[PDB]
């Protein structure tokens, strides 16, 4: 029996802590792992032509600090998911370039 | 050899994706007369059409 037990591997995350200087919630099963939707996954998503789901992922699942509470509210109350905003990382980039 | 080769392959894919990041379909047809020629079968010296081996990808 090798020490790679499933109980130590299984993990799930709906909402939890977020990183400090940026949103895009904290990674790692230790804290509350948000699974990395890295670049190749973006490419695969584009190749399907699947655009709305990509925007959903990168904006309101990860970063958008205002939309996030809004989608939670919509889910809780059963309303249409709102329109995505601007991810909070683009503005930190803007401030750093400035 | 597996590790370095997958690293270089990933980098190459990144390059190719960036170059082709803007090749998307726009029109049904341009009606352009221009085109390329593909050989398909080659004439046999005795006289016969043998299917070119690499036809399925051409």
């Amino acid at each position: 029996k090798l020490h790679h037990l499933v109980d130590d591997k299984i993990h799930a995350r709906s909402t939890g802590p977020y990183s400090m200087i940026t949103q895009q919630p904290l990674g790692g099963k230790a804290q509350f792992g948000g699974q990395r939707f890295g670049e190749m996954e973006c490419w695969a998503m584009q190749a399907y032509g699947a655009a709305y789901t990509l925007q959903e992922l990168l904006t309101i699942k990860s970063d958008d600090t205002v939309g996030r509470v809004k989608v939670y509210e919509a889910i809780v109350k059963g309303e249409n998911i709102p329109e995505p905003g601007i991810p909070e990382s683009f503005k930190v980039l803007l401030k750093e370039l400035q | 050899d597996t590790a370095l080769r997958t690293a270089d392959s990933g980098y190459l894919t990144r390059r190719l994706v960036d170059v082709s990041q803007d090749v998307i379909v726009r029109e049904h047809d341009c009606q352009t007369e221009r085109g390329i020629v593909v050989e398909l079968a080659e004439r046999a010296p005795d006289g016969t059409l043998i299917r070119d081996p690499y036809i399925e990808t051409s």
Partner: protein, 90 residues
């Protein structure tokens, strides 16, 4: 665990949202006269907790009335009719 351990929850936020919804509702069930005083005593209506003097002045009445009714409201609000639905939000 301190890493952004002071951000929004979206669970406390919605809990507070439905909190004020149900508070305004349960308060609307009873008579308005109790409601204005209970709002401004603690400053719910506009964020300013005013005292017996201010409420009496706003409604041209003595502070003693307001103390009675705000005590009457405080005593009457022990009714499970109001406290039962609004029990777990504490």
């Amino acid at each position: 665990f301190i890493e952004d351990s002071e951000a929004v929850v979206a669970v406390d936020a919605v809990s507070f949202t439905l909190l004020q919804d149900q508070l305004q509702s349960v308060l609307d069930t009873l008579s308005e006269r109790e409601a204005g005083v209970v709002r401004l005593r603690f400053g719910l209506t506009d964020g300013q907790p005013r005292t017996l003097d201010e409420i009496g002045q706003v409604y041209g009445v003595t502070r003693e009335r307001i103390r009675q009714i705000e005590s009457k409201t405080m005593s009457k609000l022990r009714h499970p009719s109001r406290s039962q639905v609004l029990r777990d939000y504490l």
